[PDB]
Curated annotation (Swiss-Prot):
ADP binds at N31. Belongs to the type II topoisomerase family. K(+) binds at I79, V82, G85, S89. It is found in: Cytoplasm. This is DNA gyrase subunit B. Residues 1-186 are annotated as: ATPase domain. When the enzyme transiently cleaves DNA a phosphotyrosine bond is formed between GyrA and DNA in an ATP-independent manner. In the presence of quinolones this intermediate can be trapped and is used as an indicator of drug toxicity. It comes from the Bacteria. Changing E27D: 7% supercoiling activity, 16% DNA-dependent ATPase activity, fluoroquinolone-induced DNA cleavage normal, 40% ATP-independent DNA relaxation, binds ATP normally, complements the N4177 ts mutant. The chain holds residues 16 to 218 of 804 of the full protein.
Length: 186
């Protein structure tokens, strides 16, 4: 990930005018949409949190959790930390904190990253009936300058375009700073 850290603008877009900041959300959403498509209920939820973080939840099958034979760590960690849209590893690299929650095969798995560094191995923390993947990220204020807060209408505009393109995927957008919400479903 150091190539990303070295030149984040080259991977995510402009880090001073809000372009890169919002693209961070869009990269995660792309992956959530892929996940949602391959599931039954096909809903994603994008939440803008009061502390200037964003979460994206899908109801898909959960991304794989088993050990990657070559890399020797969970497949989820390979996704989050190996360079492959630019990939969610870029998002993780430029997040001062990132929380991953995977619900799969009857189990909840959790893992925390800081600046793309895992704080511990992906771990089973409980049991569950549901499936899905949730990422919540705090963009690094060392990288993102000037425009450091998420603009609702920028997210809403893109999510609307996406709903037409991904028919039958339900997209919910929630702003916890002011109660604003939307529901895009074509
Ligand atoms: N929140 N959905 C989601 C789905 C797949 C991946 Cl790889 C990530 Cl990082 C997030
Ligand atoms: N604050 C801060 N910025 C970092 C960038 C890369 C790895 C660790 C880091 N801690």
């Amino acid at each position: 990930l150091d190539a990303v850290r070295k030149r984040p603008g080259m991977y995510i877009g402009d880090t001073d005018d809000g372009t890169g900041l919002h693209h961070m959300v869009f990269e995660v959403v792309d992956n959530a949409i892929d996940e949602a498509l391959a599931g039954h209920c096909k809903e994603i939820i994008v939440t803008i949190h009061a502390d200037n973080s964003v979460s994206v939840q899908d109801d898909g099958r959960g991304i794989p959790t088993g050990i990657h034979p070559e890399e020797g760590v969970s497949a989820a960690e390979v996704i989050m930390t190996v360079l492959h849209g630019v990939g969610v590893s870029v998002v993780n690299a430029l997040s001062q904190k990132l929380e991953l929650v995977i619900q799969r095969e009857g189990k909840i798995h959790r893992q925390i990253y800081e600046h793309g560094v895992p704080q511990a191995p992906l771990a089973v923390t409980g049991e569950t009936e549901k499936t899905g993947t949730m990422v919540r990220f705090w963009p690094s204020l060392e990288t993102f300058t000037n425009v450091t807060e998420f603009e609702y209408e920028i997210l809403a505009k893109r999510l609307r375009e996406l709903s037409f393109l991904n028919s039958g995927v339900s997209i919910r957008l929630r702003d916890k700073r002011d109660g604003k919400e939307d529901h895009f479903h074509y």
